[PDB]
Design a protein around this ligand. Structure first.
Ligand code: CLA
Ligand code: CLA
Ligand code: CLA
Ligand code: CLA
Ligand code: CLA
Ligand code: CLA
Ligand code: CLA
Ligand SMILES: CC(/C=C/C=C(C)/C=C/[C@@]12O[C@]1(C)C[C@@H](O)CC2(C)C)=C\C=C\C=C(C)\C=C\C=C(C)\C=C\[C@@]12O[C@]1(C)C[C@@H](O)CC2(C)C
Ligand SMILES: CC(/C=C/C=C(C)/C=C/[C@@]12O[C@]1(C)C[C@@H](O)CC2(C)C)=C\C=C\C=C(C)\C=C\C=C(C)\C=C\[C@@]12O[C@]1(C)C[C@@H](O)CC2(C)C
Ligand SMILES: CC(/C=C/C=C(C)/C=C/[C@@]12O[C@]1(C)C[C@@H](O)CC2(C)C)=C\C=C\C=C(C)\C=C\C=C(C)\C=C\[C@@]12O[C@]1(C)C[C@@H](O)CC2(C)C
Ligand SMILES: CC1=C(/C=C/C(C)=C/C=C/C(C)=C/C=C/C=C(C)/C=C/C=C(C)/C=C/C2=C(C)CCCC2(C)C)C(C)(C)CCC1
Ligand code: SF4
Lengths: 164, 30, 91, 80, 735, 85, 201
């Protein structure tokens, strides 16, 4: 009834109105245990962004490579082992440096997903409806990418073909 | 025989688990 | 080796000594209980426990040969078991 | 300091008060017994917990009860 | 003198050293802390659980890392019956050259590993010092996960409420199905995928596991229902473990008995066992009701269980709220179950060795059995102690009573005198007669006429052995008979393996028993009954007795009620635990003495020595202790030393700690307060030391603290001296 | 609710809202049939014919599971009969 | 699950508005000081006092590393191993087959020199009332104010100059260890490469 995604079920109590992308999709009632939807939305958006970047990297590594030889592997899962540990540890340290401040931030803030990242100011001057539309676009694209990046990983692990 | 790199990174990871332990210890209060 | 599973073939190893001890120990317990209950209805029950009434003691002790019969004649009359005058702790 | 409670089973026989080594108990007027007196514990800060008070109690399960609690240099009997 | 016992202001105001001592011993009694609520209690317990699991995983990771780094795991793989496993290296500056030479193993002084981790890890499919390192890395990662979770669930928005903590049905469904069944399913997956091929020479690592089929048919029989295909072609009787010679292709079989080479359970047997356990527990995890309208409400189940004629009172009506609202009832139940479970582990890992080449590792066998039996005794005593604590501080008679009539738990306090009297009668019966028979054998053998001994054949236990297939006592009962329906039923499934193992003199599976086994089992029964008597008496009498009809008002642990009313020493329920610890130690000592002597005679071959000398006490004293203590005490002599020197030092150390416990137990307070006062005067009245003064007034240890310290010394000395003796005796006698 | 009882038989609510509405004349014969079927399945999988890897017969196994069940069905049948159902 | 609340409404996180703005360095310092007092009040941890002391030690240790490379190159730094018969079994490292490999004598000498310097440090630590700059913060003393991303460009023997040089030396040590770990050569080999060859010549 109240779920748009599952037009027959009634959504849970915490799925209503605000927090764009709310289509009443919580059949298992996971939202009933979390105190609020702030942390789960932060986790969902982090997954969405990481999955978008992962899909883009998957395709680009399929087609484009860095000039060096160590980056010449086309299969992303094989490149996970072919690439030297120095590059991967540098990436991990960069991510952890970004992650510790946001670790302090996420567990207490009202909008843990709002990291203040807008270098090009794509949101300055946008109205509330436009901002909500942008949030919906981001969430949609992220969910589709998550499904897609998991599918790419599965098909590479099951057939060895990294794409198509 | 394990290498110096293997033992060193295990020591580094053990340090990280130590900082997580004091955070739990301090969060369980004085 | 003693075969004490209960078979009468090796009955002289455990079963017959078991019956003998049960008789003797029931005799002892019965005469002790009878003496306790008998001097428990006198003016000075505690005095007759450190200074035994040897006449009454001898009278009771030689009467223990019927302890299996006396026990299953006092249990039937309800004189063997107390009911609720027994004391209990707080909980 | 330890906790000392008095219960209305008190018969006012004064044996608790005259057994206290630290002057914790005293006899106060009452109307719940023949003697017209009941024990009181107005100086429990000096209570040492030796429980001499309830060793002299003749009532069935006591009328003065000592509950050991937080310790103090007075309650620990420390001359130093 | 302040701020240390942050959780207790009453202790923080103590001007004496008692504040420091009591601050340690009350740190984990969260229910007694100042400014305490139930929500904070459950949240703190939850975080402490997380930290504890992290500690366990870190300990396992450390064992893995030290075996990988300083052990000889790889060398032990190629020769498991001759190479002695190494636990970790030794660096001690106090060593002389002789100690370095004696403890020297390969490249550095090291300790032999008696934990049996080598055999366990080899069985589950580890062949490289890099496999152990991966396990250590993963376990440290898991410890980090658990520490992060423990920190997280103390944060404001992530702290669970009381309703979540007391949600019994959800926790049971998940624990049973998820934890037990799914962990068994994952363990079956690992067993098959990795362990089964690794025992057959095929390496299945974290690289070629998505492409190496655990079975040649590959999941086709499972979906097709042809589940027999996974049992076809098992490992032959000439299979060399870890090699493809004589191997098979089956992954789930019934074989029974042991591997002909490793003398341990078949890996395909254990995989099938865990798969069956997984299915059963996953099924059983759907019993209780959750958000989907089907299942059980355990309150209704408990309330509806009242016998109609009426002999349990009103039944179990008040038990749901009693257990839910008490953390000591649940803790006691869990501790009792864990004690029974670890007793089961001890009793089954020697009769049915599950790890390759563990049967021939006699020192590790003895160490494992002793360790698990001692842990079992500790857990049982803890269960009873927490039952007593529940009686003192959590039991509510009103909840367990409906209109005067009492429920199943409240009725245990009505016939408490009957229970205690009959426990006392059983204990006296067993003690009197076991000691009588033992002393009769002592006197009769001493007078040179051993034929007059009273030796009772354990026919009841031998009857059970024959029922399981042992054709040694000529009973021809159930599985000792080839015509009984019990034998014809499994003649094609697991009897040929089981019979071949039970009817073998080199196994520990159903060891042959005689009159000595009878007498020692009666001694064990006496010990169990007396420990149970002490613990049950303390639990039931916790809320009060005739000597103290208000014992519940004084708490679980208090020193006494004074010298009045004849004297009230050791009257609290804590004192019952304290007294029962000695009896638990004695009972576990009897059990471990019996096990170790039986297995020393079995391994050495002189089983006639046990069967003859175990019927009288001097036989034990002379042939077990005095005989096998010779290698241990000669770990260092005025002529030299051996690698057993550390065990002799630990032997003497245990004796010393035992006797210091004797100090703390025999001599009580009051004698130590006046001496401390004299010392205080001496310090206060001496120059050059008056400049230094204490901040906390030095006082003697409290009565309860003194009892605890004496018990701790007694127990630590007991454990250390027996561990040293068993290990050193096994090592020095059996090569 | 109130599964607690003190009379001769428990209330029908203890059977769940599926067995609470079965007439006893249905549960009784059903319980007897289930017991007979389960005993026969157990005696056909084992006892009469020795078990083997090639002979497991999910019908006999599933069947045999009706013996434990039978116990519950006739307990419920008695409960329904005593509750005028 | 559904008929109850897993987290009570009374236990909910509140956003800390007191850290508005407050760049990650200020936020981290404030979080450390509030979360761990009595070690923050001593100046330990992410503090300007600790940073200054560690920078001084890093500069002195760059000097020590140069000296060690020079000593190794110029025939100093004694040869062989320690005498187990003279210094006990604690100096024995391993026994391969009948020979005891001991701690190198050069390592022992370098440890003795480091012991000299560390002893000087320990004396200065337990000499707070007679040293110009203390190791820890007095109760009341407040930590010097962080220098920021770029300390003031004040040449000479100034606090800013020592601060900048200590930061540079600590970063250099971090880079040296990172290069040695990533590439796989000895620390002195990395220093030799980073000096062209003028050290181990
Ligand atoms: C997002 C939608 C999506 C789309 C368009 C495809 C499209 C395709 N998948 Mg795929 N897949 C997806 C999601 C998707 N998948 C997900 C969510 C999973 C599970 C994580 C998989 C798992 C999967 C496997 C295991 C395989 C494919 C294969 C294929 C190809 C046939 C085709 C290109 C197959 C193929 O050709 O692999 C190259 C194949 O073997 N997919
Ligand atoms: C002679 C009378 C007598 C009788 C009928 C009983 C009967 C009983 N006693 Mg008992 N008891 C007695 C004397 C007696 N006792 C004495 C004298 C003592 C002090 C040592 C005890 C100490 C005792 C304990 C500690 C326990 C019992 C228990 C029991 C019960 C179980 C049986 C048992 O364990 O035996 C126990 C018997 C003994 C330990 C030995 C008794 C010592 C001698 C043989 C008895 C005295 C003989 C007496 C002098 C004869 C004089 C009579 C003469 C003048 C006419 C049972 C109700 C147990 C119980 O409660 O179970 C329900 C239990 O735990 N009793
Ligand atoms: C599938 C979901 C799931 C899983 C895997 C777990 C798992 C766990 N929970 Mg948990 N929990 C869940 C859902 C789940 N929970 C839910 C939904 C709730 C809310 C209702 C809770 C509420 C909850 C609380 C409040 C607590 C836990 C705790 C724990 C941990 C217990 C300690 C441990 O490591 O045991 C490991 C145990 C095993 C791996 C198995 C033990 C094997 C036994 C001993 C052998 C028995 C075999 C046999 C029966 C022996 C007898 C022989 C037979 C013949 C009778 C464990 C990690 C506790 C903890 O430590 O928190 C960190 C704790 O305090 N949980
Ligand atoms: C009348 C309907 C009907 C019937 C009788 C069956 C019967 C069967 N199906 Mg099946 N199936 C059906 C409808 C049906 N299906 C539908 C509607 C779908 C989806 C469109 C499937 C999809 C399906 C798959 C994907 C598979 C089967 C398989 C099987 C066989 C395995 C049974 C077994 O041993 O349990 C096995 C027991 C367990 C797995 C656990 C207990 C069995 C003959 C399996 C097979 O290989 O058959 C040869 C198999 O892999 N079925
Ligand atoms: C998982 C099991 C478990 C859990 C959760 C608890 C939890 C609890 N128990 Mg409990 N207990 C357990 C098992 C458990 N126990 C077992 C197995 C026993 C039997 C031995 C007991 C016996 C017991 C008693 C008798 C009491 C408790 C109490 C308590 C409560 C406070 C604990 C406290 O203050 O610690 C204090 C911790 C210490 C004093 C540390 C003691 C450390 C010992 C001495 C070992 C250290 C020596 C070490 C081996 C050194 C080696 C020497 C070297 C030379 C080799 C708490 C609720 C107390 C309470 O008030 O409950 C309400 C209480 O009176 N428990
Ligand atoms: C070798 C030492 C020794 C012996 C023989 C006993 C004997 C006994 N203890 Mg015991 N105990 C001991 C050491 C010992 N304890 C120590 C060190 C502690 C730690 C403080 C305890 C703590 C303890 C508790 C807490 C309890 C016992 C109980 C018992 C009795 C158990 C019933 C029984 O066996 O009756 C048979 C008796 C014997 C075999 C010994 C006496 C028989 C002699 C030889 C007769 C000789 C006649 C001439 C029994 C009297 C329990 C009890 O009273 O049960 C009723 C009980 O509750 N004991
Ligand atoms: C163990 C390694 C080690 C080493 C090599 C040094 C090296 C040094 N410390 Mg030092 N220090 C150390 C550990 C160490 N410290 C520790 C652990 C502490 C804490 C107690 C200190 C506390 C400390 C203080 C408080 C001082 C030093 C000082 C010094 C310098 C004295 C050398 C000199 O006189 O130059 C010529 C030198 C940089 C002094 C300094 O700054 O240089 C003169 C100084 O005042 N250190
Ligand atoms: C990358 C992406 C968006 C990236 C946007 C970025 C970084 C924007 C960053 C900024 O705005 C911020 C944040 C703040 C501004 O102030 C600054 C900038 C910097 C401007 C979306 C991808 C979104 C990606 C999506 C939705 C991908 C969907 C993929 C699908 C359906 C793939 C399907 C398949 O892969 C399978 C499954 C199997 C294959 O075999 C077959 C096919 C069909 C190829
Ligand atoms: C790089 C470093 C620290 C980096 C920290 C970072 C990026 C922190 C980032 C964050 O905080 C933010 C930004 C925001 C937070 O919310 C989150 C995180 C992510 C946490 C420290 C180096 C620190 C490096 C140090 C301290 C080096 C010390 C060296 C000394 C003392 C010298 C010793 C010697 O001289 C002797 C003693 C003897 C000689 O023989 C040998 C030598 C070694 C030469
Ligand atoms: C300051 C220093 C040493 C100072 C020494 C002092 C004061 C000694 C003082 C003395 O009193 C003593 C103690 C003892 C006396 O007997 C001797 C004297 C001399 C009198 C070393 C710094 C040493 C500093 C070093 C080695 C710096 C290395 C930096 C690197 C590699 C930087 C790399 C990057 O810059 C790139 C390349 C690209 C960027 O984008 C990224 C990064 C990574 C930042
Ligand atoms: C104090 C108290 C408590 C505690 C208690 C305890 C601690 C108990 C213990 C208990 C126990 C510890 C018990 C045990 C039991 C056991 C059993 C019950 C067993 C059974 C078994 C069986 C039944 C078996 C059978 C068989 C056989 C014999 C053969 C084979 C097969 C079969 C299976 C058939 C609580 C807390 C609760 C509460 C409060 C009070
Ligand atoms: S303890 Fe009993 S006696 Fe000693 S003082 Fe307090 S009350 Fe008087």
């Amino acid at each position: 009834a109240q779920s748009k995604a599952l037009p027959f079920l009634k959504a849970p109590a915490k799925l209503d109105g605000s927090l764009a992308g709310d289509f009443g999709f919580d059949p298992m009632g996971i939202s009933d245990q979390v105190a609020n939807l702030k942390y789960v939305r932060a986790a969902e958006l982090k997954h969405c962004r990481v999955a978008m970047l992962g899909f883009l990297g998957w395709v680009v590594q399929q087609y484009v490579h860095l000039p060096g030889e160590i980056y010449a592997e086309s299969n992303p899962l094989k490149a996970l082992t072919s690439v030297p540990l120095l590059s991967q540890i540098q990436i991990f340290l960069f991510i952890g440096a970004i992650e510790l401040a946001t670790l302090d931030q996420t567990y207490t803030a009202d909008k843990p997903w709002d990291l203040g990242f807008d270098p090009l100011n794509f949101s300055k001057g946008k109205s509330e409806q436009q901002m909500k539309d942008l949030e919906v676009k981001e969430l949609k694209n992220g969910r589709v990418a998550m499904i897609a990046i998991m599918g790419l990983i599965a098909q590479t692990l099951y057939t060895g073909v990294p794409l198509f | 025989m394990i290498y110096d790199s293997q033992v060193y990174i295990a020591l580094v990871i053990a340090v990280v688990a130590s900082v997580l332990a004091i955070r739990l210890g301090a969060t369980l209060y004085n | 080796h003693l075969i004490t599973d209960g078979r009468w073939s090796h009955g002289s190893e455990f079963l017959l000594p078991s019956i003998l001890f049960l008789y003797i120990s029931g005799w002892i317990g019965w005469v002790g209980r009878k003496y306790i209950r008998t001097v428990g209805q006198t003016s000075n029950p505690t005095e007759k426990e450190i200074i035994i009434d040897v006449p009454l003691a001898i009278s009771i002790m030689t009467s223990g040969f019927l302890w299996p019969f006396a026990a299953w004649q006092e249990f039937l009359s309800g004189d063997l078991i107390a009911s609720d005058e027994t004391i209990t702790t707080s909980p | 300091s330890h906790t000392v409670k008095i219960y209305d089973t008190c018969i006012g026989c004064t044996q608790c008060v005259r057994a206290c080594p630290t002057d914790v108990l005293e006899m106060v007027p009452w109307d719940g017994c023949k003697a017209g007196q009941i024990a009181s514990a107005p100086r429990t800060e000096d209570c040492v917990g030796c429980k001499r008070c309830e060793t002299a109690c003749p009532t069935d399960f006591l009328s003065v009860r000592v509950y050991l609690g937080g310790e103090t240099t007075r309650s620990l009997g420390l001359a130093y | 003198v302040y701020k240390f016992p942050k959780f207790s202001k009453a202790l923080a105001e103590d001007p004496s050293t008692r504040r420091i001592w009591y601050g340690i011993a009350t740190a984990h009694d969260f229910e007694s802390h100042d400014a305490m609520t139930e929500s904070k209690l459950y949240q703190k317990i939850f975080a402490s659980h997380f930290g504890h699991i992290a500690i366990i995983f870190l300990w396992t990771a450390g064992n893995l890392f030290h075996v990988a780094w300083q052990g000889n795991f790889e060398a032990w793989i190629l020769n498991p019956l001759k190479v002695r496993p190494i636990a970790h290296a030794i660096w001690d500056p106090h060593f002389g050259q002789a100690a370095y030479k004696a403890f020297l193993k390969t490249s550095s002084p090291a300790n032999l590993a008696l934990s049996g981790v080598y055999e366990w890890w080899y069985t589950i499919g580890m062949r490289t010092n890099n496999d152990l390192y991966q396990g250590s890395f993963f376990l440290i990662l898991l410890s980090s996960l658990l520490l992060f979770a423990g920190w997280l669930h103390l944060q404001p928005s992530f702290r669970p409420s009381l309703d979540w903590f007391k949600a019994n049905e959800y926790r049971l469904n998940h624990h049973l199905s998820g934890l037990f069944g799914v962990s068994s399913l994952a363990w079956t997956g690992h067993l098959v995928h990795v362990a089964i091929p690794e025992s057959r020479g095929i390496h299945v690592g974290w690289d070629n596991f998505l492409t190496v089929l655990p079975h040649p048919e590959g999941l086709t029989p499972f979906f097709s229902g042809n589940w027999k295909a996974y049992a076809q072609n098992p490992d032959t009787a000439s299979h060399i473990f870890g090699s493809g010679e004589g191997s098979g292709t089956a992954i789930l079989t019934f074989l029974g008995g042991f591997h002909p080479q490793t003398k341990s359970l078949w890996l395909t047997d254990m995989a099938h066992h865990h798969l069956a356990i997984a299915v059963l527990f996953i099924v059983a995890g759907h019993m209780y009701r959750t958000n989907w309208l089907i299942g059980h409400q355990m309150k209704l189940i408990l309330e509806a269980h009242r016998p109609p004629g009426g002999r349990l009172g009103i039944g179990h009506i008040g038990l749901y709220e009693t257990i839910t609202n008490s953390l000591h009832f649940q803790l006691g139940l869990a501790l009792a179950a864990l004690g029974v479970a670890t007793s089961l582990t001890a009793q089954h890992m020697y009769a049915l060795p599950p790890y390759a080449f563990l049967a021939s590792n006699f020192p590790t066998q003895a160490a494992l059995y002793t360790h698990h039996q001692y842990i079992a005794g500790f857990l049982m005593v803890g269960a009873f102690a927490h039952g007593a604590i529940f009686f003192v501080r959590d039991y509510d008679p009103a909840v367990n009573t409906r209109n005067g009539e009492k429920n199943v738990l409240a009725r245990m306090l009505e016939h408490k005198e009957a229970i205690i009297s009959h426990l006392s009668w059983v204990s006296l019966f067993l003690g009197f007669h076991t000691l009588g028979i033992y002393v009769h054998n002592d006197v009769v053998v001493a007078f040179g006429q051993p034929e007059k001994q009273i030796l009772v054949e354990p026919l009841f236990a031998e009857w059970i052995q024959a029922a399981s297939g042992k054709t040694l006592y000529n009973f021809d009962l159930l599985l000792a008979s080839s015509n009984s329906p019990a034998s014809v039923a499994s003649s094609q499934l697991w009897l040929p393996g089981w019979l071949s193992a039970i009817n073998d003199g080199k196994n520990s599976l159903f060891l042959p028993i005689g009159p000595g086994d009878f007498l020692v089992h009666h001694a064990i029964a006496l010990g169990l009954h007396t420990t149970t008597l002490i613990l049950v008496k303390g639990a039931l009498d916790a809320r009060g007795s005739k000597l103290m009809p208000d014992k519940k008002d004084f708490g679980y642990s208090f020193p006494c009620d004074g010298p009045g009313r004849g004297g009230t020493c050791d009257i609290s329920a804590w004192d019952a635990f304290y007294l029962a610890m000695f009896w638990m130690l004695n009972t576990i000592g009897w059990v471990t003495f019996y096990w170790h002597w039986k297995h020393l005679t079995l391994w050495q071959g002189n089983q006639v020595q046990f069967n003859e000398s175990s019927n009288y006490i001097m036989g034990w004293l002379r042939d077990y202790l005095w005989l096998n203590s010779s290698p241990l005490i000669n770990g260092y002599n005025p002529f030299g030393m051996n690698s057993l020197s550390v065990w002799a030092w630990m032997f003497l150390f245990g004796h010393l700690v035992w006797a210091t416990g004797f100090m703390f137990l025999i001599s009580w307070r009051g004698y130590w307060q006046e001496l401390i006062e004299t010392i205080v005067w001496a310090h206060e009245r001496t120059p050059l030391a008056n400049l230094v003064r204490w901040k906390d007034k030095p006082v003697a240890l409290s009565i309860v603290q003194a009892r605890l310290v004496g018990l701790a010394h007694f127990t630590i000395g007991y454990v250390l001296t027996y561990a040293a003796f068993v290990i050193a005796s096994t090592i020095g006698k059996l090569g | 609710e109130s599964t607690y009882w003190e009379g001769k038989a428990p209330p029908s609510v203890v059977l769940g809202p599926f067995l609470s509405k079965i007439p006893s004349g249905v549960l009784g014969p059903a319980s007897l049939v289930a017991l007979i079927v389960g005993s026969y399945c157990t005696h056909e999988s084992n006892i009469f014919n020795t078990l083997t890897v090639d002979t497991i017969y999910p019908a006999y196994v599933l069947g045999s599971f009706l013996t434990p069940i039978s116990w519950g069905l006739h307990v419920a049948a008695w409960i329904q009969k005593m509750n005028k159902a | 699950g559904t008929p109850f609340d897993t987290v009570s409404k009374d236990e909910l996180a509140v956003e800390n508005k007191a850290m508005a703005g407050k760049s990650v360095f200020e936020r981290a310092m404030a979080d450390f000081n509030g979360r761990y007092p009595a070690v923050a009040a001593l100046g330990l941890g992410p503090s300007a006092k600790a940073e200054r002391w560690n920078g001084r030690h890093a500069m002195f240790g760059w000097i020590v590393l140069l000296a060690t490379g020079y000593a190794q190159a110029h025939g100093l730094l004694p040869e062989g191993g320690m005498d187990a018969k003279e210094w006990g079994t604690w100096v024995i490292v391993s026994t391969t087959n009948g020979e005891q490999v001991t701690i190198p004598a050069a390592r022992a000498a370098i440890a003795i020199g480091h012991l000299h310097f560390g002893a000087v440090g320990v004396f200065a630590a337990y000499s707070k009332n007679s040293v110009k700059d203390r190791l820890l913060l007095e109760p009341g003393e407040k930590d010097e104010a962080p220098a920021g991303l770029f300390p003031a460009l004040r040449p000479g023997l100034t606090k800013e100059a020592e601060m900048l040089n200590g930061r540079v030396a600590m970063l250099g040590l971090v880079a040296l260890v990172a290069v040695s770990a990533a590439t796989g050569q000895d620390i002195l080999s990395v220093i030799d490469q980073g000096l062209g060859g003028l050290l181990l010549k």
